[PDB]
Amino acid sequence: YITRKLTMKPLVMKRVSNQTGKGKIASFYALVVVGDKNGMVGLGEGKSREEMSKAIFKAHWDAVRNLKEIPRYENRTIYGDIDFRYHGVKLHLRSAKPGFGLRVNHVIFEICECAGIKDLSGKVYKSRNDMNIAKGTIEAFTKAQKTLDEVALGRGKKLVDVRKVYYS
Amino acid sequence: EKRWQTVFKPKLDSVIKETPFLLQTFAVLEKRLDFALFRAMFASSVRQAR
């Protein structure tokens, strides 16, 4: 299941130094996202001294471990707007009409492509770090999103009642 | 290219499997006469239809 269905895309690939007394030691950080495009996604991180390949390797395993189900509306978009603050990134994301593109920041684009979020429009305010953007994106996707079924049951209402009325 | 940009329609049209909404990116061209000839197999190319 895991290899054939999950798709891996590197999001961050960089060199971070830890200057020790003898000299500058340089290691490789990699941040990746694995998603089946069908409502399951996860993020992974890896750190390797000798070659980035090992960093991406451990990142792939870590992403596989943290693979989690993601709420989705019609299997194409978020249930409602998500306004989320994560360690200095402000993500404002909006659900969209069918056929709407992924008109978002690129990091969010790969995350949505991996997780099967077809439709979204969003803006990133305050800091624009890709690392924090990705972490906050997944967190706001899973914590900050509530399914209409769950909302209705928590309110003890039928889906017909909670569903919005059509106006024109 | 600067003509295709003007011709390009940012708003598309759509009337269990998944609808491939964004394959309709170039559906606007399908109503041009030369494209209609090529799709009707009345020419071996769009340039030949032209």
Partner: protein, 526 residues
Amino acid sequence: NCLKYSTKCSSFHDMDYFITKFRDDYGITPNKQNLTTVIQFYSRKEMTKQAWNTFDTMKFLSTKHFPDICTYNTMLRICEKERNFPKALDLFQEIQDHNIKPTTNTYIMMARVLASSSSNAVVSEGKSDSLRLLGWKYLHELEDKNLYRHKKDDLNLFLAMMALAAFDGDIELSRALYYLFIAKKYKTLCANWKGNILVDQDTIWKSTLMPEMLNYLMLAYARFDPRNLPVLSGYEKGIELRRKFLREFDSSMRLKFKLPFLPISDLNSEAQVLAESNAIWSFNMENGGTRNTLTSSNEAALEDIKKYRQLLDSFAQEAEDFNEFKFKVMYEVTKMQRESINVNVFNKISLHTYLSIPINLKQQKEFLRRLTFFTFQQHEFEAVIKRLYEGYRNNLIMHDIWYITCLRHKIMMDTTLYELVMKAAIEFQNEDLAKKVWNDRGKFRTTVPFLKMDQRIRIAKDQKFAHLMVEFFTKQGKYSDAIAIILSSKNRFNWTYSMVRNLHKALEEIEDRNSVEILLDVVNKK
């Protein structure tokens, strides 16, 4: 006590008199118990909104007035009646939150609410199997602890189980439960009957046959799908419960009184299902065999024809006017039906389920035989009585006498039964049946039972029939006539997209942009 009896007689005026009397002359306002009784009143009159308002006030006024587990059970009953399972679940969570202690009735009522909610995909929101499962889980949680029991709760528990058995199409469990209930009721009554068993056999069987069990069993029959798998099959507690009940039923059959259940654990074919449906229906109509009405002979036919000839031709002259002669015939036929067969098991509801069995099972012949044998059209009866009126006042006559005689076997065709036969026509795609039924409905509009009803109910039922006709012409592929029916009555009926979704889909398949546009304009002009 005043409100208790007023509820039991369903007298709204008496409620107003007693409450106003106490408030005006005595300074007495309803407490928690009286307000719970008022909620039960509102539930009796099917006034759900007022019941919820009263419940809110009980919470609002004071902690003494605050609802307890009894009022919560009543509110769960209201949820059952409205098939509102999210509110029932939320309420159960409230009883847990407010630290109120559940009772046996709370679990049984929750199980019944879930069973009723799981009837259709529409009312169940597409979680029907899950809801039946959750009702079973609530019954298990009941089985865990002693709680507080009530003399009636046991009966309800059986019904609750049967509900979960009936809506899932589990014939074998429904049969087992029906047999066990009837057997225990019969043995308990016979063991505790003051008189001799033989003479009072009629009363014993009338007490034994609870129409609710029959209706639930016939619902279990109607929802038969051979490819279905019971929800109770999967679980270990569920499979153990199923095994225990089926073993008990088997042993009881292996070991007086007899029931016509076929000698098989399960019915695997539609034909056997029809056979058992006819068997149990006939047994109930006969009061368990005490009344020998359904069995017939040409001797009995001729003698009864002679007797009703004498009776009716004598009564014809005596009546002052044709209206009074109709009143006498009505009284005679009505009392005759009750003496003939038990009133309770024979009614619109059980008949609706019984006729619904073949429709789901897809046999036309059995459905039409049952409809003809157990139903009569009102206008036909009135015409027959007019014919016999002119005949006596001033083989067809033998036919009319036999008709008035066989009315003991029949119930009038109400709007709901006509709509059921329309559903049968849709399912079987019989144009002749559809034409016959919308002729008979048009005639029935003239007869006095239809005009007795209120105008809004008449218009709602006519809108339902128009929608059924639209569905029939849609499935037959005659789209133009469906659009014609919609267009002709656009003003008289409020047409919603929920009604015309089938038509809109089937028009869009062929891309009739003109017809789609006109239909959508009719619906959405608003």
